[PDB]
């Protein structure tokens, strides 16, 4: 059988953007197997070994002026440049979420009613889902499955609300997302 | 509030090489090292931008040379296998006979090599299935997505069968219309 040892090498250039392109930070990092050995942080200005394994590299790369100069300018020529190029289909990409409300198939404790607010197919991942009972927000009894990234530029999430239904009550699920100018609401008529 | 990552890797002895760009966790594109071309995650991206694939091929050759140097420098310290967390979900609330897609999420694992198979009623399914390349993680492990478009029914049950050197036995995540 195939039992040979594996040896992995990863190289990552991370461009972190704050307030659009106002504040930009480049983090270049080398990782041997699962160990990051050396990195170039634009905030530091030079390579720094992360573990003894990376020491020879930080030393050798820092002695190369053309390399260091290129690395120091990448925040502009690399990061800001690629941000400008992809902004229209990434930062500005927007897909409205599909929202539906129905009681959970679970319903553990009897005289109750676990409600489920399903929000799916949206982008970006930033979103706010709230539950309301007669216009007033529900603080307790709210449970979420968390934000799920589908890997296809779409997200989904389930937010439950344990209730003690009273004929005539209106439980509203409110969703605020960059795709809509006004919040989306779906009501459950108890 | 936004992170763009250019992630690359070379794995010996498999000779696996990968070059991709990531936007807030979602793949923008990767380069097909064999056909030597850019593969946009979503078709329309390619109409808004371009990437010279050959640049990924130049980098990959440097990444391999460095892997060799580092392999020797660590005294041939091999990687520790970390088995994947596997989850199966649909990309939207399932409704009978309502077109949906099964998602097999393979996460937190390394090295980046896995064998994934879909099973419908204990039988391998090939039709319509697709998959992503290996995606990066802050902890330097990897993520991966495998998809299977399907038509829900109480008669069909599915299993995402995952193999990895970190798993002593193949892992099968079952799925069925829970009602």
């Amino acid at each position: 059988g195939d039992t040979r040892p594996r040896f992995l090498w990863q190289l990552k250039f991370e461009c972190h953007f704050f307030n659009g392109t106002e504040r930009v930070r480049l983090l270049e990092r080398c990782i041997y197997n699962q160990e990051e050995s050396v990195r170039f942080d634009s905030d530091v200005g030079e390579y720094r070994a992360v573990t003894e394994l990376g020491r020879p590299d930080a030393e050798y790369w820092n002695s190369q002026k053309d390399l260091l100069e290129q690395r120091r300018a990448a925040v502009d020529t690399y990061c800001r440049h690629n941000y400008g190029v992809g902004e229209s289909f990434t930062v500005q990409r927007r897909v409205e979420p599909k929202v539906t409300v129905y009681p959970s198939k679970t319903q553990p404790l009897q005289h109750h009613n676990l409600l489920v607010c399903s929000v799916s197919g949206f982008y970006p991942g930033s979103i706010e889902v709230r539950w309301f009972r007669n216009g007033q927000e529900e603080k307790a009894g709210v449970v979420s499955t968390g934000l799920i990234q589908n890997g296809d530029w779409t997200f989904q999430t389930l937010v439950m609300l344990e209730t003690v239904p009273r004929s005539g009550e209106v439980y509203t699920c409110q969703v605020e997302h960059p795709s809509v100018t006004s919040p989306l609401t779906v009501e459950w008529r108890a | 509030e936004h992170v763009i990552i250019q992630a690359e890797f070379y794995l010996n002895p498999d000779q696996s090489g990968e070059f991709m760009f990531d936007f807030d966790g979602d793949e923008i594109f990767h380069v097909d090292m064999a056909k030597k071309e850019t593969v946009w995650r979503l078709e329309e991206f390619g109409r808004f931008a371009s990437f010279e694939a050959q640049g990924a091929l130049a980098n990959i050759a440097v990444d391999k040379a460095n892997l060799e140097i580092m392999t020797k420098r660590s005294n041939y310290t091999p990687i520790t296998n970390v088995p994947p967390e596997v989850t199966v979900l649909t990309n939207s609330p399932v409704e009978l006979r309502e077109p949906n897609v099964l998602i097999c999420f393979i996460d937190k694992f390394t090295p980046p090599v896995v064998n994934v198979t879909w099973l419908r009623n204990g039988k391998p399914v090939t039709t319509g299935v697709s998959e992503t390349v290996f995606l990066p993680r802050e902890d330097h492990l990897f993520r991966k997505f495998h998809y299977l478009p399907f038509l829900p029914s109480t008669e069909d049950v599915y299993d995402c069968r995952v193999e990895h050197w970190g798993l002593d036995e193949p892992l099968l995540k079952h799925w069925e219309f829970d009602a």
């Binding site: 250039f13 020879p56 690629n82 400008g84 | 250019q6 140097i69």
Partner: peptide
Amino acid sequence: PEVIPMFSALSEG
């Protein structure tokens, strides 16, 4: 518009 990559730095042999 073109996405531009950063080029790999080679370790000293």
